[PDB]
Amino acid sequence: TTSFSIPDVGLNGIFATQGDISTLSGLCRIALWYGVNATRPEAIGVGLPGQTA
Amino acid sequence: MQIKTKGDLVRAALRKLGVASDATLTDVEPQSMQDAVDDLEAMMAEWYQDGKGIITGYVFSDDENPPAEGDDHGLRSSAVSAVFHNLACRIAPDYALEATAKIIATAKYGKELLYKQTAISRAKRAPYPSRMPTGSGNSFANLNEWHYFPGE
Amino acid sequence: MQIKTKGDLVRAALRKLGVASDATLTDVEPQSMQDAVDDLEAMMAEWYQDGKGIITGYVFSDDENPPAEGDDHGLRSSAVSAVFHNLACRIAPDYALEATAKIIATAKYGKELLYKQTAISRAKRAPYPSRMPTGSGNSFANLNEWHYFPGE
Amino acid sequence: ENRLESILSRFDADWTASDEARREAKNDLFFSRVSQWDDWLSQYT
């Protein structure tokens, strides 16, 4: 297992690798855990042009 | 092809032997034909040793469908001659007969040709032993820590 | 060629065997003709192992065509002798005869000549192994980074 | 006239003129420092 940083966004996840049995192959997983939250829904907004009829 | 049934194979074998054909005035008994079909089935099962012998595509009849004769043998176009030549050679002793030299040679040639393709397919080389290194010229394997062959 | 059909091939084989020819006083028997045609079809199928055997140009009849006899065999001019000599040798035991030494020798010679060109064509050399360098003499490949043969 | 065009033209001329020697030198460095099996264009099974 290794640390694995996503560029641009400021997040760090894991990069894990395991090997199969009796064969030259393996599995690789790039996992990363996050949850997006809106603490002030009244502060966010939306713009909707052309909302006629 | 005009030989599409086990009974057709038996009739061809008998014609090759000279015992019965479509031109003779005396024909063999249906009991004799059934015995020849039993021989053909037994010989084919002996050849096809539960899938680990001479693969030919022959289809083994079941007892639910009553008559073995009348079933398609399923052989490819290039197996019929070998099959019925060997069958004639095998059923020759039934009639105090002896298959001729041409029939025997053709049976041998046909059996060899039948097994040729299966032998070519089966001539497969075993994998590397479990103790052989993969060498450092295999860059990705060396980096990813597959330093020895798996084997098996 | 004046031998243009399976019937001509069968008639030539029977004449060579002495079964039915104008040299004797016998005509070709209609029931013998069908069996000889079946034997010829089986022998062509056994030879031509679905493309991996002896290539001759023979055209295999289908179920739709009513008479097996009458179709052009499609053989080249250089295979007729081999085909009908082998046919005579194969269908001799039907009449409890034995093909003579000249007929057998001609059949062997014809089959060898039939496979000569195909053997020459298949005498091909395997490509270079993928672990062989191209050598620094091959300036084009070495500049283009082809330091080893592609193989396969 | 353009400074960028003149500089790029000169650089392109030199880079293309000195290519073969550079490729041979890079191959020598790779062979002597990484691995003697410079076999990446040959597609084995």
Swiss-Prot record, chain A:
Subcellular location(s) per record: Virion
Provide the disulphide bond pattern.
none
Query: Where on the tree of life does the source sit, at the highest rank?
Result: Viruses
**What's the stated role of this polypeptide?**
Self-assembles to form an icosahedral capsid with a T=7 symmetry.
Q: Please provide the record's free-text comment about the domains of this protein.
A: The insertion domain (I domain) plays an important role in the folding of the capsid protein by acting as an intramolecular chaperone.
Q: How does it assemble?
A: Interacts (via N-terminus) with the capsid assembly scaffolding protein (via C-terminus); capsid proteins and scaffolding proteins form building blocks that assemble to form the procapsid. Interacts with the portal protein.
What family classification does the UniProt entry report for this protein? Answer: Belongs to the P22 phage major capsid protein family.
Protein name per Swiss-Prot or TrEMBL: Major capsid protein
Q: Which organism is it from?
A: Salmonella phage P22
Q: Which residues of the full protein are shown?
A: 378 to 430 of 430
From Swiss-Prot, chains B, C:
Q: Where in the cell is it found?
A: Virion
Q: Predominant location of this chain?
A: virion
The reply to whether Repeat figures as a keyword in the UniProt entry is no
Q: Which InterPro entries match?
A: Gp4_sf, Tail_accessory_Gp4
Example GO biological process:
symbiont entry into host cell via disruption of host cell envelope
Supply the alphabetized keyword list: Degradation of host cell envelope components during virus entry, Degradation of host peptidoglycans during virus entry, Hydrolase, Late protein, Lyase, Viral genome ejection through host cell envelope, Viral penetration into host cytoplasm, Viral short tail ejection system, Virion, Virus entry into host cell
Record text about domains: The N-terminus changes its conformation when transitioning from the preassembly state to the postassembly state.
The name of this protein is: Head-to-tail adapter protein gp4
Give the species this sequence originates from: Salmonella phage P22 (Bacteriophage P22)
Gene giving rise to this polypeptide: 4
From Swiss-Prot, chain D:
* UniProt superkingdom: Viruses
Where found? Virion
Q: Which function does this protein serve? A: Forms the portal vertex of the capsid. This portal plays critical roles in head assembly, genome packaging, neck/tail attachment, and genome ejection. Procapsid assembly may initiate with a nucleation complex composed of portal and scaffolding proteins. The portal protein multimerizes as a single ring-shaped homododecamer arranged around a central channel. Switches upon genome packaging from an asymmetrical conformation in the procapsid (PC-portal) to a symmetrical ring in the mature capsid (MV-portal). This change of conformation may serve as a signal for headful packaging.
On assembly, the entry states: Homododecamer. Interacts with the terminase large subunit; this interaction allows the packaging of viral DNA. Interacts (via C-terminus) with the head-to-tail adapter protein gp4; this interaction participates in the head completion. Interacts with the scaffolding protein; this interaction initiates procapsid assembly, thereby ensuring incorporation of only one portal ring per capsid. Interacts with the capsid protein.
Protein family (similarity comment):
Belongs to the p22likevirus portal protein family.
Protein name listed in UniProt: Portal protein
Taxonomically, what lineage is the organism?
Viruses, Duplodnaviria, Heunggongvirae, Uroviricota, Caudoviricetes
Full-sequence portion shown in this chain: 5 to 49 of 725
